[PDB]
Structure formats: structure tokens, C-alpha cells
């Protein structure tokens, strides 16, 4: 009933700060933690920020 | 009759602030939603932010 989505493509140049949502305390309105099924694509060639 | 165009390079260090429109809730006034054809030059150079 109440679910959001989030599409979003990993790349080798990504910053968290556009995931999760930037900060200002983080602007994280409608991203992924607050968001009931999350979709990434291609999670092989991130960056080492996104995968800690 | 009502189409709106719009012309974009993308660059290295472009920034989505200037493509779709600044927030102030958005001032998206004649940028991208709410355009009929976008033009957008060099895409294999934008950022990871534009291109999500």
C-alpha cells in the first residue's frame, strides 16, 4: 500500500551524496533510506565510497 | 504549435542545477519538464548525477 520506488545506475565515478541523497542533516527525501524496494544497476563497478 | 525547445552541452563538471532548473520548489521554468524537444550535445561526458 505504501511502497516507493528508486532507480538508480552505479558508476565507477558515483558519490554518495547522490544515492542516499546530499547533505546540508542529509537531504534525504526520497531515495533509499526511505524507500521500500530499491533497484541498482550494474553494482559491479562502483566506487569503494558506495561499497562501505 | 506548442513545442518548446532547448540546447545543452553536457560537460565534465556540468551539474544538474543547470539543466533541469535550480531549486529555490524547483525553478524549472523552460529547461527540461517541461519541454517538447531537448537537445543534449557530447552526452558520453556528463556527470553521474545528470546521467541517473
Same mark, same amino acid.
Given at each position: 500500500?505504501?511502497?516507493?520506488?528508486?532507480?538508480?545506475?552505479? #558508476?565507477?565515478?558515483?558519490? /554518495? &551524496?547522490?544515492?542516499?541523497?546530499? $547533505?546540508? =542533516?542529509?537531504? #534525504?527525501?526520497?531515495?533509499? /533510506? &526511505?524507500?521500500?524496494?530499491?533497484? $541498482?544497476? =550494474?553494482?559491479?563497478?562502483?566506487?569503494?565510497?558506495?561499497?562501505?
Amino acid at each position: 500500500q505504501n511502497a516507493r520506488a528508486f532507480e538508480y545506475l552505479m #558508476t565507477r565515478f558515483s558519490t /554518495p &551524496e547522490e544515492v542516499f541523497g546530499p $547533505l546540508s =542533516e542529509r537531504l #534525504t527525501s526520497g531515495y533509499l /533510506p &526511505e524507500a521500500e524496494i530499491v533497484f $541498482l544497476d =550494474e553494482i559491479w563497478k562502483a566506487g569503494p565510497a558506495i561499497l562501505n
